[PDB]
Design a protein around this nucleic acid. Structure first.
Ligand code: MG
Length: 113
RNA sequence: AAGCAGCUUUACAGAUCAAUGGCGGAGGGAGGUCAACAUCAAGAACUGUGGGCCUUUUAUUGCCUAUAGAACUUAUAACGAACAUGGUUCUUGCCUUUUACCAGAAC
């Protein structure tokens, strides 16, 4: 096993470095999702219960989505629908219509966060 | 517009009473505080069908063109010359808290 592991060579990859730092959340940044269709923007959820949408090219703040009362723990954008799904420590699961920037559906039944 | 000739013919009477073609007949009408199914808000916005068309063979759809038929609804835009409630979010009001609520918006 060690022979056949040591003979092989890993592929080279270029190093990473820091490009930009964005501040504007009031709590810890807990989740990120990229625009899975056009790569134009990304969204972040936070301990400050908001969600913020960021222009990926300039890093500037597009809009703030305020629809949770506790930490937004995860965010997911659908590639087949114009929908953002978000979940929180406040036990709610919410769908946002990105053609209006409004909650349109709540999904109920989780006992805990 | 009536008197006469042409079209229509039908209550009839014929040649014909054969060979034809025309229009009907081979399961009736009016109703029901009966039912089921289909359909009713959209490029002013409809479906079928003949020929041509991008999907690599244009198929059934989307496009061009020819043509037959469109019931209901609608421009001081809606089936309803009528008019309720509820959910979510936002902003207000009353406000000791929730329900029940104040009244505007959006979906
Ligand atoms: Mg209490």
């Amino acid at each position: 096993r060690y022979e056949k592991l040591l003979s092989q060579r890993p592929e080279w990859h270029a190093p990473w470095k820091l490009s930009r730092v964005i501040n504007g959340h009031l709590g810890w940044v807990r989740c990120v999702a990229i625009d899975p269709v056009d790569n134009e923007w990304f969204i972040t959820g936070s301990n400050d219960t908001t969600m913020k949408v960021w222009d990926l090219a300039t890093g500037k703040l597009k809009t703030t989505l305020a629809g949770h009362v506790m930490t937004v723990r995860d965010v997911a954008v659908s590639d087949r629908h114009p929908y953002l799904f978000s979940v929180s420590e406040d036990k709610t699961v919410k769908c946002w219509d990105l053609e209006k920037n409004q909650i349109i559906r709540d999904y109920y039944g989780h006992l805990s966060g």
